[PDB]
Amino acid sequence: QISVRGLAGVENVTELKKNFNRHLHFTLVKDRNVATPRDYYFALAHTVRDHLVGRWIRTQQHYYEKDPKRIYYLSLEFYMGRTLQNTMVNLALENACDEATYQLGLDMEELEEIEEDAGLGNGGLGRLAACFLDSMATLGLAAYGYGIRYEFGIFNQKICGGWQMEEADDWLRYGNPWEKARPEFTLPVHFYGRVEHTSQGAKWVDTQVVLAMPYDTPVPGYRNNVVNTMRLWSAKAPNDFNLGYIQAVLDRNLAENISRVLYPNDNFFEGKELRLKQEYFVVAATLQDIIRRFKSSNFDAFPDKVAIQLNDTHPSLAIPELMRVLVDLERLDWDKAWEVTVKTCAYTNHTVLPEALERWPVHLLETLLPRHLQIIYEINQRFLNRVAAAFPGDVDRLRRMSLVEEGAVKRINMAHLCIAGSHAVNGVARIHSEILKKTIFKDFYELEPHKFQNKTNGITPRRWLVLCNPGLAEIIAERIGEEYISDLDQLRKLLSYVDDEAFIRDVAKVKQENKLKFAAYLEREYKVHINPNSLFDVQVKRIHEYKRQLLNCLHVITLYNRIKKEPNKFVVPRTVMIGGKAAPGYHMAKMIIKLITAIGDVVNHDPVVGDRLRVIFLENYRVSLAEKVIPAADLSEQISTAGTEASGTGNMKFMLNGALTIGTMDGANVEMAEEAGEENFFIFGMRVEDVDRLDQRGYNAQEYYDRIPELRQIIEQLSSGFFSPKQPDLFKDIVNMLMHHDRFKVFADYEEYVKCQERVSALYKNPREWTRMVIRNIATSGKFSSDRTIAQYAREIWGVEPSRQRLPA
Amino acid sequence: QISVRGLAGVENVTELKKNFNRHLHFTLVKDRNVATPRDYYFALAHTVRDHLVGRWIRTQQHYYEKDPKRIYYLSLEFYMGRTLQNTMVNLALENACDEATYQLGLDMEELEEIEEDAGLGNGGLGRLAACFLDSMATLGLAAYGYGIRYEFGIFNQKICGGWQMEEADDWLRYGNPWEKARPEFTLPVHFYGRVEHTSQGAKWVDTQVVLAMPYDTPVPGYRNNVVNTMRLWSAKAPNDFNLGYIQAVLDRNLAENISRVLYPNDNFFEGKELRLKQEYFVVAATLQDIIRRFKSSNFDAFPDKVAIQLNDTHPSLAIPELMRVLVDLERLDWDKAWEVTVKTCAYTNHTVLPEALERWPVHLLETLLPRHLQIIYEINQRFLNRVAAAFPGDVDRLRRMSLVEEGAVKRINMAHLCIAGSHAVNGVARIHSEILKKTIFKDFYELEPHKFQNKTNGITPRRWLVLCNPGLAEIIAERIGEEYISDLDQLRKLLSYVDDEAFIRDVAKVKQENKLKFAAYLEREYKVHINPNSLFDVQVKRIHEYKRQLLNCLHVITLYNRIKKEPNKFVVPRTVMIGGKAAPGYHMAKMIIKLITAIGDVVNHDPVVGDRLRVIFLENYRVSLAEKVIPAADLSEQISTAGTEASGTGNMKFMLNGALTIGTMDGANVEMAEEAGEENFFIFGMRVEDVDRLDQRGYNAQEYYDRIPELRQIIEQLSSGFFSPKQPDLFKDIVNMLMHHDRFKVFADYEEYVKCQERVSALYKNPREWTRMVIRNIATSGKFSSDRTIAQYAREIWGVEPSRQRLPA
Ligand SMILES: Cc1cccc(-c2cc(=O)c3c(O)cc(O)cc3o2)c1
Ligand SMILES: Cc1cccc(-c2cc(=O)c3c(O)cc(O)cc3o2)c1
């Protein structure tokens, strides 16, 4: 149909159809008369998978022959989403499959909707892992994603009475055709036990064994015939485990619980044992596998053959574990083992928010990982000796820099461990990386300035343009060709089309189509009625105080109060859509969801309002909902308090997809505004510097309440039950927090936000100029490709060269 | 190679090879350089499965068009064993696959050994279910095996220090290529709750829901192109289950425990809740499915379209459940629902031993199945009203016949429920069925004589001859053709070959080859050295007091003591092999294993003994070990106390396979001796009548001890630590039981056993006459085909006609 979806040749289509029918019959054991849409999805899934297999085998073969340096991306989270469409895109099969399925009388788009998201992540961090794998495959790096195959991913979000309810995400119920179990590569992971000191070193004994069984999922590069591997570990009990009889068998579930469920916290540390077990499990199994591969190519060459990237501190135990293997098992001396470790490991920091930093109680590590604790103490001692020597007499520095925190309970600072044991530490946006050096890691920076880097985040333009927004991909392809899909910087060529009437018309047409398609999706799947001519004002992301969905709420109520004051005045109509999951134990986040829906209950049913203002809570925000709503958005809401959002990646998704951004100078927003020009961005609010100024003198919210009548009105409405008639005080916690303990200074940004929002409405009234500004955004979005990011990691951290050369078919 | 294994045509072989390589590549994602024997097994498994699929789809299609009466075999146990070889046999693919694999340079027999047994059964009962499915498919009945897909089957048995250790049978670890999950046919099963009485009937409310997900396994008939289904249910939690968050997800394991593990008790009732849950689970899901099918063809026709066979009382709740559906959900009146139920259901009794009879406490049923209990009470009342009217004034009868037992705790007699709610009740051998009518069900018989039938057990000659003993199958085929494989009565034609020198030579040659092959298997897999010229004296079966492995032990020690008395006298050399699992909680059974191995420790290391007497405990007796050891046996030990072994099926396996039988007039032994002639059978010991005589006067073991010096010697040796030097009193429980509380009268049969064993040795010294008697056994074994059995069930219970007509390919 459209060009970027590849060729639908007569041979190709005939082949796909016959393989489809082969799978329906032999794989699914169905015939045409009993097959459900789900059977059909499966037959197609198996058919597309068949095209991966040759390339997968060849690619892994190739890495064996060539023996390049191997990159190991360790993450507790891989937020993959659906695999089918992505596979077709990267293999150029999309049109062929559309055609083939069409001829069997099936709608491919309908079958695509049947696939479960692999929701093995919370948000930004998990999705970054997923874009990375895609980019690493596209850039022909010998790269492996290593994580945990959780039985249950991020919970499914239901709204009941405007409240979030959680349901188990049973994503494996119907099978996963993408994975391949590899029982033959099963490895033991050890827990508990005790340390025995002998003549020939320390020994870890009387451990409990859990087995780690790997599942391999193919990761196809973009049209380069490279297929990398994501290896996820499953926990399995050994067969002598507990071995009255019945209970012993039933108690196997204790061991296997390790890989049962993803912890649903976003930028929040919960110090639970099961979480530490997950962290050790993935690290122990991965390291063994890494070392097995290495030995099948002394340890001096390890760092020339291995890079290990730590995605946050979640896999920080990789550092003590590598030491443990090198010292205790391989019999290297400390100093050599340590050199190998530092040169192997690199650490990506994802946030500066203190609630997110992993500080594990010592008593937990003492029981669970007694040897790792000893190794940690040893690292700490030697590290602090370096500090002492560099900064003699600075006792305070020693305290601040220690891996071990004194206090109520002793804790290990996992971030301190990561910096000590890594040759590179990066933040995820320029401003975030600067903050790391100015603030939380100032001390570490002064010791080892060479370690601290920036690697600004990116997104894959495969999933995030071609896949989710084929209409926009095509009109771009029409002008500048297809080369940009794997070289996003080429989008700059679009700047010469900013005064082109045809292009302006096309850009606006795709947006309108996306909006119609999304408005219809709302009706079908959730029985809700939105005006497609309204401005689509979208804030989608995890529900957090720092991300200030509440600021958006205040704007929404303001628009509402303004309409009621002057019903007969013109306002640019808006659909305000807010979506995201709250962590199940995060009371305040659960309250914000309730407020959002409660505002909707009032606003959407007011006859005076008309279709001038709608408030929609988008249920079950996940990767596949993002693919739908982001192409449909006009305004991207990126309104975190300056200094809190380390980077963000949503912001990039919307830039790429023809939305304008309203946002603070926070995270990658800064680099985005710099790329597009400040005049093509709706920047408001305090800068980092202003927030600091407010902190020194003290944040008094009352001041804002006293001076801004519009704001006082909102707060009175909240307090008095305007938005909760049956429970007048439902929102007392919200009001109380805003007035007395707002860490995120919602009121401070209120005035500048509302004014800046007026400027958005003003520009929306002028379609041609709106669209021209959109063009200037899309055209400068190239920096925010994960290909750029990965190329930077490869050159400046991993010490490998990216490649765009095809492997042979 | 050999004829009964089918044709290896050039097209066939070429096809198999290319499909093998297709699977290796696409299914297994391996190439030739990385494939393990296990990969190869899998590729072949997938290749053979492909040949089933067409026939499976066609067969189920056919049952839809023709709409015949459907047989539902409900069992908690299906002891399937391996599927690969069986599939090849029934599809005539065995030679083709041998050839194809040979040309790829693989040994098919080596790959066959990689397959896990589906050990979803304990012993006789479970294996009977498996032979039945085979026969039902061979006789073209529209039949469905319904059970539970246990994650863990019968435990793997290790011997450590001569003691049984249990290990989890993780049979699904590497995948099961035979099953097909059918998530779309998932059904809710309800538990707990309470009963509400309304205007329009009783209602079962506030229940916990567990989901039952079915897995279908194909059951191929012998060369008739019929493929039936075994549907096994897996327990799955609903997604709102428990739904702080983490624990809720982890607690899903409570619900799913239902299908986790097979209870490893053989002829023993354990009144545990989890077992009752398993029993309800399989019944609830099966009935719903049965009814769904029926409605897609009023309830008057149900019994013309449905037969439900209850394999023991394990699925007895089918009766109250059917009532519950008909009365509470479908709104039939009691009497009509009851008529439908009785005409639908039939009950097979498997034992008369009281320890085996299911007597569920009322308090358990009250909590778990409150409605079923009410229905049970209602059945009881109406049943006892019939009894009262037929036997006025016989208050005692009423007590004896009640479904509800009075006492310490009230219990439901599940057997009483089965008789009341079934139109047919059968035993499993003539003598067993007679005992049912004379003793435990005398009262029920007098009320409804028409209900009581015999259906003597059988075994499938597919698995139990062709598959495990191809050499014997062939020499038979050479003389009389192949027709006997699906018509075992034709073995009678062999009687005219009893004086044929060539046949005698061939029969003896196959036995010798089987023995050599098995002796070698012992060396390879278990590093043990046996003389292949010895008589192979084999007792393989679950370890039980009633089966009197101890009697065998007494014989073994006798032979030993006789050798030591007269070292320089000739004795026919014997390898005595004893194998079987003990239930994990069955202390006495665990002691017998220890005694067996302890005898081995003494006997096998005595230089005076030479290779004249060896004692081997065969570890991990299971279906696939039976396939190996049974073809290799000379003497089948069937030595249960008369009246205890309801039938036995091992006895039949050995008859078919060229062993002579030493046994009591117990179970099917009686019919076997009747078929072959008593003079071709080594019958010894008390009859049923003699045991009764001993019971009236009282069993004094001391008497036997006082009168039989040979026996006194053994008992003194046991007592004084001859067989346990380091723990002199290890076997005090054994001695004490034999002397004071032997329910099975081991000493009573001792003298007659030892003498009869001498007659076996005498005949073994004369190979020609041994072999002639063997011929007379094989030739009369035809009655013991499960095809005869199933044909009898079909005609006299289910009301359907068997068929040997092929379905079209
Ligand atoms: C970064 C930040 C700033 C403020 C608050 C939070 C946060 C996130 C959570 O997921 C959370 C939780 O699950 C339970 C809880 O009791 C408190 C929590 O607080 C995180
Ligand atoms: C038929 C029969 C006659 C005598 C004994 C048994 C028998 C079988 C068992 O599996 C068993 C057990 O698992 C635990 C136990 O405490 C006692 C048991 O007794 C069965």
Short mmCIF file of all heavy atoms in Angstrom, two decimals, chain B residues 37 40 44 97-98 101-114:
data_model
loop_
_atom_site.label_atom_id
_atom_site.label_comp_id
_atom_site.label_asym_id
_atom_site.label_seq_id
_atom_site.Cartn_x
_atom_site.Cartn_y
_atom_site.Cartn_z
N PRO B 37 21.75 -34.75 21.43
CA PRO B 37 20.80 -35.84 21.22
C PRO B 37 19.36 -35.42 21.55
O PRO B 37 18.43 -35.87 20.89
CB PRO B 37 21.37 -36.99 22.07
CG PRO B 37 22.86 -36.72 22.03
CD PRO B 37 22.97 -35.21 22.13
N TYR B 40 17.72 -33.67 18.75
CA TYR B 40 17.42 -34.67 17.73
C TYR B 40 16.14 -35.42 18.08
O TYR B 40 15.33 -35.66 17.18
CB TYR B 40 18.59 -35.62 17.49
CG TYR B 40 19.79 -34.97 16.85
CD1 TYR B 40 21.07 -35.20 17.33
CD2 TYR B 40 19.65 -34.12 15.77
CE1 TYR B 40 22.18 -34.60 16.75
CE2 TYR B 40 20.74 -33.50 15.18
CZ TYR B 40 22.01 -33.74 15.67
OH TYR B 40 23.08 -33.14 15.08
N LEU B 44 12.66 -35.33 15.75
CA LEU B 44 11.94 -36.53 15.37
C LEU B 44 10.53 -36.51 15.96
O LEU B 44 9.57 -36.86 15.29
CB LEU B 44 12.73 -37.76 15.83
CG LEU B 44 12.07 -39.09 15.48
CD1 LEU B 44 11.92 -39.25 13.97
CD2 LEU B 44 12.81 -40.26 16.10
N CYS B 97 11.18 -44.30 9.91
CA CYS B 97 11.89 -43.40 10.81
C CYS B 97 13.26 -43.96 11.17
O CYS B 97 14.22 -43.19 11.26
CB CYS B 97 11.08 -43.10 12.06
SG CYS B 97 9.63 -42.06 11.72
N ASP B 98 13.35 -45.28 11.41
CA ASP B 98 14.64 -45.92 11.63
C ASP B 98 15.58 -45.58 10.47
O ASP B 98 16.68 -45.09 10.69
CB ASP B 98 14.53 -47.44 11.81
CG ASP B 98 15.45 -47.98 12.88
OD1 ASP B 98 16.47 -47.33 13.17
OD2 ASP B 98 15.12 -49.03 13.47
N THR B 101 16.40 -41.73 10.09
CA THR B 101 17.30 -41.26 11.13
C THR B 101 18.69 -41.84 10.89
O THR B 101 19.69 -41.13 11.04
CB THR B 101 16.75 -41.49 12.55
OG1 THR B 101 16.53 -42.88 12.76
CG2 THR B 101 15.50 -40.70 12.88
N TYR B 102 18.73 -43.13 10.50
CA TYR B 102 19.96 -43.82 10.14
C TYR B 102 20.74 -43.05 9.07
O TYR B 102 21.96 -42.93 9.17
CB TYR B 102 19.70 -45.25 9.65
CG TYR B 102 20.92 -45.97 9.11
CD1 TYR B 102 21.84 -46.55 9.97
CD2 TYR B 102 21.17 -46.06 7.75
CE1 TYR B 102 22.97 -47.20 9.49
CE2 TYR B 102 22.29 -46.70 7.25
CZ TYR B 102 23.20 -47.27 8.13
OH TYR B 102 24.31 -47.91 7.65
N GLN B 103 20.03 -42.52 8.07
CA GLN B 103 20.64 -41.82 6.95
C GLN B 103 21.16 -40.44 7.35
O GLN B 103 22.06 -39.91 6.70
CB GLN B 103 19.67 -41.72 5.77
CG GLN B 103 19.61 -42.99 4.93
CD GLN B 103 18.51 -42.97 3.90
OE1 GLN B 103 18.09 -41.92 3.41
NE2 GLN B 103 18.02 -44.16 3.57
N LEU B 104 20.56 -39.84 8.39
CA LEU B 104 21.07 -38.62 9.02
C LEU B 104 22.18 -38.98 9.99
O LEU B 104 22.71 -38.10 10.68
CB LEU B 104 19.93 -37.95 9.79
CG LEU B 104 19.01 -37.02 9.01
CD1 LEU B 104 19.40 -36.95 7.54
CD2 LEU B 104 17.56 -37.43 9.20
N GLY B 105 22.50 -40.28 10.10
CA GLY B 105 23.57 -40.75 10.96
C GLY B 105 23.22 -40.73 12.44
O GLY B 105 24.08 -40.47 13.28
N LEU B 106 21.95 -41.00 12.77
CA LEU B 106 21.50 -41.04 14.15
C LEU B 106 20.94 -42.42 14.47
O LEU B 106 20.42 -43.09 13.58
CB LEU B 106 20.45 -39.95 14.38
CG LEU B 106 20.92 -38.52 14.15
CD1 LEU B 106 19.77 -37.54 14.23
CD2 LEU B 106 22.02 -38.13 15.13
N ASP B 107 21.06 -42.83 15.73
CA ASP B 107 20.44 -44.06 16.21
C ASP B 107 19.09 -43.71 16.85
O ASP B 107 19.03 -43.07 17.90
CB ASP B 107 21.39 -44.82 17.14
CG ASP B 107 20.91 -46.19 17.59
OD1 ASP B 107 19.72 -46.52 17.37
OD2 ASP B 107 21.74 -46.93 18.14
N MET B 108 18.00 -44.15 16.21
CA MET B 108 16.66 -43.88 16.70
C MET B 108 16.46 -44.41 18.11
O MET B 108 15.77 -43.76 18.92
CB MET B 108 15.60 -44.50 15.78
CG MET B 108 14.21 -44.03 16.13
SD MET B 108 13.09 -44.27 14.76
CE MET B 108 12.71 -46.02 14.90
N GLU B 109 17.05 -45.57 18.42
CA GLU B 109 16.82 -46.17 19.73
C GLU B 109 17.41 -45.29 20.84
O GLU B 109 16.82 -45.19 21.91
CB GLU B 109 17.31 -47.61 19.83
CG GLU B 109 16.27 -48.60 19.34
CD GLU B 109 16.65 -50.04 19.58
OE1 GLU B 109 17.59 -50.28 20.37
OE2 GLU B 109 16.01 -50.93 18.97
N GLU B 110 18.53 -44.63 20.53
CA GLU B 110 19.19 -43.72 21.44
C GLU B 110 18.32 -42.49 21.69
O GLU B 110 18.25 -42.01 22.82
CB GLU B 110 20.58 -43.40 20.88
CG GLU B 110 21.49 -42.64 21.83
CD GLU B 110 22.80 -42.22 21.17
OE1 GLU B 110 23.35 -43.02 20.38
OE2 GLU B 110 23.26 -41.09 21.43
N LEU B 111 17.64 -42.00 20.64
CA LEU B 111 16.79 -40.82 20.75
C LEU B 111 15.52 -41.14 21.54
O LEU B 111 15.01 -40.30 22.28
CB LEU B 111 16.44 -40.28 19.35
CG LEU B 111 17.58 -40.02 18.36
CD1 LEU B 111 17.03 -39.52 17.04
CD2 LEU B 111 18.60 -39.03 18.91
N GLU B 112 15.00 -42.37 21.38
CA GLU B 112 13.81 -42.84 22.06
C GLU B 112 14.02 -42.79 23.58
O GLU B 112 13.12 -42.41 24.31
CB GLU B 112 13.43 -44.24 21.60
CG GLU B 112 12.60 -44.24 20.33
CD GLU B 112 12.58 -45.57 19.60
OE1 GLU B 112 13.28 -46.49 20.05
OE2 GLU B 112 11.89 -45.67 18.57
N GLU B 113 15.24 -43.12 24.01
CA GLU B 113 15.62 -43.19 25.41
C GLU B 113 15.66 -41.81 26.06
O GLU B 113 15.77 -41.71 27.28
CB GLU B 113 16.97 -43.90 25.56
CG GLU B 113 16.90 -45.39 25.30
CD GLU B 113 16.02 -46.14 26.29
OE1 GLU B 113 16.00 -45.76 27.49
OE2 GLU B 113 15.36 -47.10 25.85
N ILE B 114 15.57 -40.74 25.26
CA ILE B 114 15.66 -39.39 25.78
C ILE B 114 14.29 -38.91 26.26
O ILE B 114 14.22 -37.94 27.00
CB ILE B 114 16.27 -38.44 24.73
CG1 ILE B 114 17.75 -38.76 24.51
CG2 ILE B 114 16.05 -36.97 25.11
CD1 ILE B 114 18.41 -38.00 23.39
#
